[PDB]
Design a protein around this ligand. Structure first.
Ligand SMILES: CC(C)C[C@H](N)C(=O)O
Length: 290
């Protein structure tokens, strides 16, 4: 099994799960989304240990099983420092592959922009370089849904009545559409969601729900800086991904030599909707830029 621990990283205590690969060829670091969820929903990537890839899972500040820092430190730049701190604390000065999902992806970019040196490669899945953009794209998605749910979002959403069932209905509908297509959601995913709704990070940084991004990161945007990234980068996104491929395009268009894979019939959590296919792509990429 994977080695688990609750160690002090850059100040607060962070939990991490390091699944060493039998005959590892490379070490992959992962960043869950949210912000304010957990590594739990990224456990499908563990399969990559069968391809000689060690996967480092970990709950970011104030997430999952990790300690919560001063609310002033609830910033992306802080996550970056935490990430680097952890990387060094565990691998000292070894260059590794960094994979982020959704917010995690955006967080990864921010990291790369500053510490791309410690990176042999970068992977952004359902990631984003601008929240405003992603939000703009999410609205389009909302309006594209059937009137029934669409208007429901617009009504209770403005009344700040997210508890309402007619609203919850739309939300969940959207989820089973752009978050995790026609699936029977695995525990791990329902584990990360349970965490976000339990901790404060999501509430503060993100806001109410997915398409309702009013948190502190509402206006974050580093598109005009991601170009500085030169290491191998694999940008993935699902056909029906909530963080539309259009968003992923903005990243691909800025990072030269980057690849862009759209997972047909898949939404946001492609790592589950196509576990084997998803895992294979990343492992191929990783070993390809070994
Ligand atoms: C910024 C949000 C769209 C990120 C989302 N909470 C996720 O991790 O999938």
């Amino acid at each position: 099994e994977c080695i688990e621990n609750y160690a002090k990283v850059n100040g607060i205590y962070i939990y991490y799960k390091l699944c060493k690969a039998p005959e590892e060829k490379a070490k992959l670091m992962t960043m869950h989304g949210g912000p304010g969820m957990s590594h739990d929903y990224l456990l499908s990537l563990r399969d990559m240990t069968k391809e000689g890839i060690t996967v480092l899972f970990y709950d970011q500040f104030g997430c999952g099983r990790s300690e919560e820092p001063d609310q002033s430190k609830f910033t992306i730049d802080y996550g970056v420092e935490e990430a680097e701190a952890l990387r060094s604390k565990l691998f000292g000065n070894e260059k590794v592959f960094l994979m982020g999902s959704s917010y995690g992806g955006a967080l990864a970019l921010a990291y790369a922009v500053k510490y791309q040196d410690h990176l042999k490669g970068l992977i952004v899945s359902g990631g984003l370089s601008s929240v405003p953009l992603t939000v703009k794209e999410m609205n389009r998605l909302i309006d594209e849904l059937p009137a029934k749910y669409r208007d429901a979002i617009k009504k209770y959403g403005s009344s700040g009545s997210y508890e309402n069932p007619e609203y919850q209905e739309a939300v969940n509908y959207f989820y089973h559409q752009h978050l995790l297509r026609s699936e029977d959601w695995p525990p791990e995913v329902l584990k990360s969601l349970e965490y976000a709704e339990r901790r404060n990070v999501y509430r503060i940084m993100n806001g109410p729900n997915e398409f309702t991004i009013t948190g502190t990161i509402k206006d974050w945007d580093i598109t005009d800086k991601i170009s500085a990234i030169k290491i191998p980068t694999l940008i993935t996104v699902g056909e029906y991904d909530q963080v539309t491929p259009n968003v992923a395009r903005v990243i691909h268009e800025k990072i030269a030599g980057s690849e862009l894979h759209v997972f047909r019939d898949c939404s946001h959590l492609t790592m589950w909707e196509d576990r084997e296919g998803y895992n294979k792509l990343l492992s191929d990429f990783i070993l390809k830029h070994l």
